[PDB]
Amino acid sequence: HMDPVSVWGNTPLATVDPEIHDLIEKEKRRQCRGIELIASENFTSFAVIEALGSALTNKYSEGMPGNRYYGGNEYIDQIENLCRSRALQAFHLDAQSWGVNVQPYSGSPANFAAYTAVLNPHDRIMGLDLPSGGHLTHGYYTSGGKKISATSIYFESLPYKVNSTTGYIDYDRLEEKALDFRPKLIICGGSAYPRDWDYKRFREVADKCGALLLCDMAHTSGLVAAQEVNSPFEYCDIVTTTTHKSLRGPRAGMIFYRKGPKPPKKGQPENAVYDFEDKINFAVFPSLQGGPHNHQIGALAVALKQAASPGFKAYAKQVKANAVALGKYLMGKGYSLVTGGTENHLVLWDLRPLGLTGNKVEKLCDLCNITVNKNAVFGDSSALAPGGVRIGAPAMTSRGLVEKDFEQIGEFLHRAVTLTLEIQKEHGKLLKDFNKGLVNNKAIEDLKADVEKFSALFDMPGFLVSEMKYKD
Amino acid sequence: HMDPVSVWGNTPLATVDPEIHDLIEKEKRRQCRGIELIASENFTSFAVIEALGSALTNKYSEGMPGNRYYGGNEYIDQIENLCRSRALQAFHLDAQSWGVNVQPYSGSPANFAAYTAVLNPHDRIMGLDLPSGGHLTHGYYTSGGKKISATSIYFESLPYKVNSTTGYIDYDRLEEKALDFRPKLIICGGSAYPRDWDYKRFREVADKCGALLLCDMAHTSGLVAAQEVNSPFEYCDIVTTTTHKSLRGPRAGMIFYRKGPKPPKKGQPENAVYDFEDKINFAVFPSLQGGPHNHQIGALAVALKQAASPGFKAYAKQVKANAVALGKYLMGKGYSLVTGGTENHLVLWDLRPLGLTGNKVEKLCDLCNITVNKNAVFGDSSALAPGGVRIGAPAMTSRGLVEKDFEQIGEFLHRAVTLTLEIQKEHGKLLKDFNKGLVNNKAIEDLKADVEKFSALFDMPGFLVSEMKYKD
Amino acid sequence: HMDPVSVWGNTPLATVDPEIHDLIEKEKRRQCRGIELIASENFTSFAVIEALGSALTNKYSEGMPGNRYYGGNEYIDQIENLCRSRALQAFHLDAQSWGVNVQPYSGSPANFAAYTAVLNPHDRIMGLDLPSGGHLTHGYYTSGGKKISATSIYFESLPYKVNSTTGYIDYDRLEEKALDFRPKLIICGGSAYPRDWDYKRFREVADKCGALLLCDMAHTSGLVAAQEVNSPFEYCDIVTTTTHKSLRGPRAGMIFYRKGPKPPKKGQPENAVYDFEDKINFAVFPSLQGGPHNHQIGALAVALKQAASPGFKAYAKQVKANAVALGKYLMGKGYSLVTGGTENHLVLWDLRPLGLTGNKVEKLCDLCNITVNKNAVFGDSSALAPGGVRIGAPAMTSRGLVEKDFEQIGEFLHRAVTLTLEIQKEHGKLLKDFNKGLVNNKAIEDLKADVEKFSALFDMPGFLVSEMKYKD
Amino acid sequence: HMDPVSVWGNTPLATVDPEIHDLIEKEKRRQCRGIELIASENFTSFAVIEALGSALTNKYSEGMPGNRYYGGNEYIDQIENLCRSRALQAFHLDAQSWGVNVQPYSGSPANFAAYTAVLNPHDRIMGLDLPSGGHLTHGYYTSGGKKISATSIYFESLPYKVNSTTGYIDYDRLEEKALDFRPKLIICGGSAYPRDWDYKRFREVADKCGALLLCDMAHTSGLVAAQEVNSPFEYCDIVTTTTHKSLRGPRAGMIFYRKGPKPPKKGQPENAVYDFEDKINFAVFPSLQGGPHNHQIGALAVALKQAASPGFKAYAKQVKANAVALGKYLMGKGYSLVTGGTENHLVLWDLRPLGLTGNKVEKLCDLCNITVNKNAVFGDSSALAPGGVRIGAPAMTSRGLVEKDFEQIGEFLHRAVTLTLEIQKEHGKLLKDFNKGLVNNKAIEDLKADVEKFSALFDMPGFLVSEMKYKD
Ligand SMILES: Nc1nc(O)c2c(n1)NC[C@H](CNc1ccc(C(=O)N[C@@H](CCC(=O)N[C@@H](CCC(=O)O)C(=O)O)C(=O)O)cc1)N2C=O
Ligand SMILES: Cc1ncc(COP(=O)(O)O)c(CNCC(=O)O)c1O
Ligand SMILES: Cc1ncc(COP(=O)(O)O)c(CNCC(=O)O)c1O
Ligand SMILES: Cc1ncc(COP(=O)(O)O)c(CNCC(=O)O)c1O
Ligand SMILES: Cc1ncc(COP(=O)(O)O)c(CNCC(=O)O)c1O
């Protein structure tokens, strides 16, 4: 005989699965008692999380609102229509000129569907090279020729790079490359580029070689919504994004695409209109995905409502101000930030002049409750032992930190990188040797203690710190 | 000035976003006051949903446990390790012989990653034709030559079919086709095939043509874990699955793959071992996906713990018994079931002897709170007006229904299709004619009420019905 | 110092290069002192050979007549124009309905250009399976899955097969395969198919699945021109051919293509016209080839004039009558011919009932100055050790042989195969054993001498036997 | 009844086809009464033409010597073995370190076969851009993105370019491109590059990106054999060539490839040997070609014997000296030669400083019995109305012309380009206007008369002028 429904189906997680409950509680503590500096991370709201964790997960709704492959979607259709309208509203787009698909499971699924919509297999793409700051899905293959992203396997990639001495995109070399290589699609936006984008120039290059132009604004989408960085929609045909980075929503993707009359082009027929909508929609489903994750879509609708608030614009300005204040602190100590600063939410920090790799700094930081990620920098031949570390402001800004707080974060990072170098100098560069300095290191314990003291001063979205299992 | 953290970040959904709150509440009522017969749907536990809606959503954790691209993953690593271990445990797999990747965002991402791991672009694949019961992602292009799934775009697909008379897989024709086409990969498992699979014969065919053999058990994975249907692991190299269908977990995908020594095969060196693990992991990340959805992985860990329990085996047994009891009832009313019954959780109902298409039935059912999906059957060209309806037992079985209750479901469907016919007979076969009959039809309203009365008799997992915003 | 022009440039081959001169004389004797039965070989005229060895070899003439990439093509243009017009005249084609490109270097270049003109890489093609009698370039990969022809590498091939009972094309299986596989191009015509083609049925199949229909008439092109076999032009979009087989010209290829209004088709604009010409021309040059071989084109113009003569119709009738007479003679001795006879210039002889493979027969025959080729038959998994031999009538018919002479050839082959049996019986079935019977075998020497005595009874085109260097 | 063999088969071309005979005679007069300056043309020997027009055309010989798919190849095998050995001897190659395939039908088939041997579809290649001097088959697509050569369709091409100011290959930019694009194959050699090649630098670049290195020596093959330009064999993996340009043979191609021990490289095993042979042979047949053209192979063996003689080295020296003397003359008149001279057999003449396109010079020259070809120059978008004209020395040097004779050719060209200018000034630049200036032009008739008088002074290889039909 079956269990009663209530026993398996209505009993709380803390009773059904104490192990997973306990680990989530440990993760909750970790999230609010360290300094979380991964530039792609945020702390989303409790309201988002309540939508995310809901009966919306139970629904199959393949297709489009009002034209589904399954019955029962009366309310799912309203949620998805609301999410789409809030997505357009959040970025101040007119529905006559822009549509959006909110079904991508994540950012990488959003980009692959966008590419599948407008490209045939082996069509040519160019995006920012990963060590220059571009994303995996922008066509990444290594300088040794190893195809890493499937966007370099199913499509033909030729990346463009930053200037090797300034760290800024070399728009002249971008243009010359696009004219030689003749891409069908040029991708802009990136994962570790600390400056804004001259989308107008990208449009000029795309028009000179007849390419489509797509912006992936995943990292800065919240800053775009808040009108705090350049808008890609003014110049790009398609804009993809994640929703969980600076937009501060659930993990999901969106694809924005132009609709309606095309701008005037020579030879182009009169009355020409954009043709993205049906192809984008079809590429997401049925080409690539299956059932939408409606709990993500519902949670995303919440997040887009929250991103369209006056409070969110001030958040986005604070993120930029915090990144700049951090950047100034680090550069004052002599740390090598790419481009010597930032115009967005992140800094990219070249550790090679110190004789360090990013994995060592990431590991030492981790032991002090400082959460970063190692990161490739220009000319790197390793991702797991790269020459850089990347620091972002969104997550801690979401806990309310301001510029002086991010100067203190800079001080903690200076202490952490100093300690990293000291350990390497005393114990050596090999990881087996370096790891010996990570044990019973009083300076690690001091820095960890200072970090948690600091972290505990601030509020925390998403859950009630007062109610967590693991207390101070 | 920024908003206080608590206002945007800790306030409940019901206050932050009353529209989305209200829409979720309406969907909760719909789920527990209708008859939910989509074969791919289930009702998952509250405990799963609590892990799904949690701070795990905030974490970036690309890579493998213990070897990540980001700091801060000490607990996320334990959660993913626990999830992988429980996945092996739930299917009684020896870790020396099988591994599993639990990062796929959903079923379609799991399949595309499995394909990408073992196939080059344009390599040949054979799966069950969609009108014969196979899935979109098994290489679906239409009988008109339209490439629908991206599996038929990036790879070269040729489907195998069921016998056009019996509805069973024609294993002789499968073999002839495999030796002609010479696929690199043969896929078994399906979405609407009401019978079990002779995996041993699939292995014999794969071995004769030199193909890899992959089973997609998405639909029956819960039945497989409970050992209530044939096990694909006995004969398949790779097993993909979703976790939200009969497995009753969150929406996610899993890829199982063989490890360790290869079985004796002539022309193969001694001491040869499987090489799937690294290709599978790399295909999931960094080839295709980005950050894992750790809230999904934690929720999946809960579901896998729930699936290994003795109560789950009783559940899987009951799902099968309910499907059989419903099939016997419908056949007793003279309806046409593909293969004349079922061996799993679903029945496939051919409506063409009745002069109906499944969109008519799905819509009529929908206005009566009977949630089904139209379904292609053999020879169909239209997906949006196909010849069949698919009915599955997992979701209502999870509410505690047994065989006599599924006989009542059978009578409700019999009433539903009878009324669909009368609407057609009275108003017309052209959809615009037929749709006249769906306006203030007292017989629809009566059937809808009766369905609600029946549904209200049963418990409901995932949320407390006594607590929902909308009652009677 | 520069040699004087006359010493290197005007001295006859016999003086400049006695080795090659001598080898050519040895080959000349071989050609008129053996029985030459390779079905794709012919003996072309001295007039063709005089054009072939001419100053036309010196000219670069890329492009089209009157629109070349080089100067000096006044006369090359008239030659190519004359060749094209003669090609249309030889097949009784209306220039308003058919065009022809005569630049392909050989048959395989002609086919690859035709495919390149109308297909993208990886588009699907269906041709007759090589063991069923199809050609390499029709998409050959082996029953072991090895891609042999580039047509199966750059395109996606799936062959259709003969019925194993009758040896004829199975047209219902062809249709079913075409409807399953959905080729963009269906190829008909073959290399070892001894029967005619139902081009009308091929057209019905191609129309049903939306495919282009190409006939490769290389082997029977001379019989087509003489209206002695079915005309592919009645039903095919494109007809490719070599010119050195039954057409009895130089080695070259030709692509014929439809021009002008398309036939009425529901699902086709009015006034729709064929669009092959420019694609076919462009695929030949500049896509694939370089400079035309103008000596070949001149020689081809000669051959096309000869093919359009009353004597050539009598020759084509004789080729067919000789093939039938040979087939009946062999079949009267108890041998197995695929399909039980022939309707064209060749017979396909299945040696497996005798316990023989074609290499053994081919090698024994070769030692006896009987020139055949081993040939795959239905079921074969080896090309260098296949189960059949192919025999053709064009070359010996061109020396003037008539039916009674081909009955004598039949008796020579009967002696050859009988001796092959006796060697195998005496020495063994393994090749290392069998080859011991080929050394100092008086019976081979006797058969060789009898073959030469018979062969010397007949005239010989292309050169004068009375003037060859190596006399009897 | 059939015609007698003698009537159709042994009768001379003059009787069988007076039309083709007459047209060939007209071409013969044109070849020895004008100035033939197409850099890719030559006048081959009578001995070559006698082998070309021989019974060798009748033989099918698919396969390799001693391992054929047909009987009867005793003498064809000896001819092909001899050709290959003479090919290695002509280029001073040790058979232990180099092999050659002499079956390619022409230059473009040779290159496509070499590519097919070592590349998969869509693998990356880099060749000299066509306007910079590279060949079509080196991956040519236009600056507008139109794929012209199939080598840019079946493979992924990114050309390298000359320095726009100097006309010389920019080896630094080649290296940067190669490191960014990561080609599998780098091609060197070209069609209109007037300088020698730094094969060492190409090898350094190929090694830095892990590419194969192929040289297409078609144009300068004869200069390479005579050791009068740099040898590509010192540094290249594969060397392809035509045989009809400076090598002065029939129209055919060859593919040379390394054999035996590989050069030392860390990571490469000891005892590593090259593996090109089987792949190259297989790519030629059975992958791409069908039956070898044995008359071309036999003719090629003759040409290779002639090329290995002492007079040929003097010929190759004279070719280079004549091209230089011609170049100096044109520059002395103020004309603009790409790179301001030549190190090989050709000059590339930029007409754009004159306000002329090459088609006008080609047409006017053609009316004056001066055979040139228009040629793309750097930055050209048009090939039929390009910016340049290309002049080569091989053909007229073969008639015995020396430097003073090529200075008169320079004067004839000066007169011709002067005349082209006068006509364009008088009648206009639109083709319809310019062409009317080509009628009743006394300066054209005077220059034509002078050209014929000059041309009649010289001997002529390949046929006896004293014997032609159209005497002067
Ligand atoms: N119907 C029909 N269609 C045609 O197109 C033709 C025809 N008849 N007759 C004449 C001619 C045959 N041309 C062919 C036919 C097939 C193949 C072909 O399949 N070649 C593979 C296998 C070769 C093989 O058999 N190897 C041994 C082992 C010993 C060893 O490999 O040395 C083994 O595997 O047993 C390879 O090269 O790998 C190559 C050339 N031809 C067109 O020209
Ligand atoms: C066999 C099979 N495989 C994969 C999937 C894809 O799962 P996602 O939707 O998570 O991408 C499905 C979904 N089938 C849904 C249905 O049959 O209604 C499936 O049936
Ligand atoms: C520009 C960009 N685009 C797309 C993605 C993909 O999102 P998913 O991980 O959801 O697939 C990322 C993730 N970048 C993660 C990081 O920069 O740390 C990104 O930076
Ligand atoms: C470098 C090069 N390679 C290959 C070829 C092709 O040869 P075929 O034409 O035989 O295919 C050419 C011909 N180039 C002709 C010219 O430069 O005028 C060539 O110049
Ligand atoms: C039908 C067919 N098509 C094309 C070709 C190719 O012709 P080339 O060899 O000129 O490339 C052949 C050659 N078949 C050779 C044989 O049957 O013996 C052929 O049989």
Numbering used by the authors:
A (entry chain C), B (entry chain D), C (entry chain B), D (entry chain A): 0 to 471
Task: Give passages from the manuscript.
The enzyme serine hydroxymethyltransferase (SHMT) plays a key role in folate-mediated one carbon metabolism, providing precursors for multiple metabolic pathways. SHMT catalyzes the reversible conversion of L-serine and THF into glycine and 5,10-methylene THF. SHMT is highly conserved in evolution, utilizes pyridoxal 5-phosphate (PLP) as a co-factor and can accept polyGlu-THF as a substrate (Matthews et al., 1982; Schirch and Strong, 1989; Strong et al., 1989). Previous structural studies of soybean SHMT8 have provided detailed snapshots of the enzyme, representative of different stages of its multi-step reaction: the resting state of the enzyme with PLP; the enzyme bound to the PLP-Gly intermediate; and a ternary complex of the enzyme with PLP-Gly and the substrate analog FTHF (Korasick et al., 2020). These structures showed that, similar to SHMT from other eukaryotes, soybean SHMT8 adopts a tetrameric assembly, verified in solution by small-angle X-ray scattering and analytical ultracentrifugation (Korasick et al., 2020).
In this study, we have determined the crystal structure of soybean SHMT8 in complex with diGlu-FTHF and PLP-Gly at 1.7 Å resolution. A superposition of the polypeptide chains in FTHF and diGlu-FTHF complexes yields a Cα root mean square deviation (rmsd) of 0.48 Å over 1892 residues, highlighting their overall structural similarity. In the SHMT8 complex with diGlu-FTHF, we identify an additional conformational change of the THF-binding loop specifically associated with the presence of second glutamate moiety (Glu2) of the ligand. The loop closes in more tightly against the bound diGlu-FTHF. This is apparent from changes in the position of the backbone of 1-2 Å as well as in the sidechain of Leu383, a residue in the middle of the loop, which undergoes a significant rotation with a resulting change of ~5 Å in the position of the terminal carbon atoms. In the diGlu-FTHF complex, the Leu383 sidechain (chain A) packs against the ring of Tyr68 (chain B), making a potential CH – π hydrogen bond (Brandl et al., 2001). Another hydrogen bond is found between the sidechain of Ser381 and a backbone oxygen of Glu2. In addition, two hydrogen bonds are formed between the backbone amides of residues 382 and 383 and the γ-carbonyl of the first glutamate moiety (Glu1). A water-mediated contact is found between a carboxyl oxygen of Glu1 and the sidechain hydroxyl group of Tyr68.
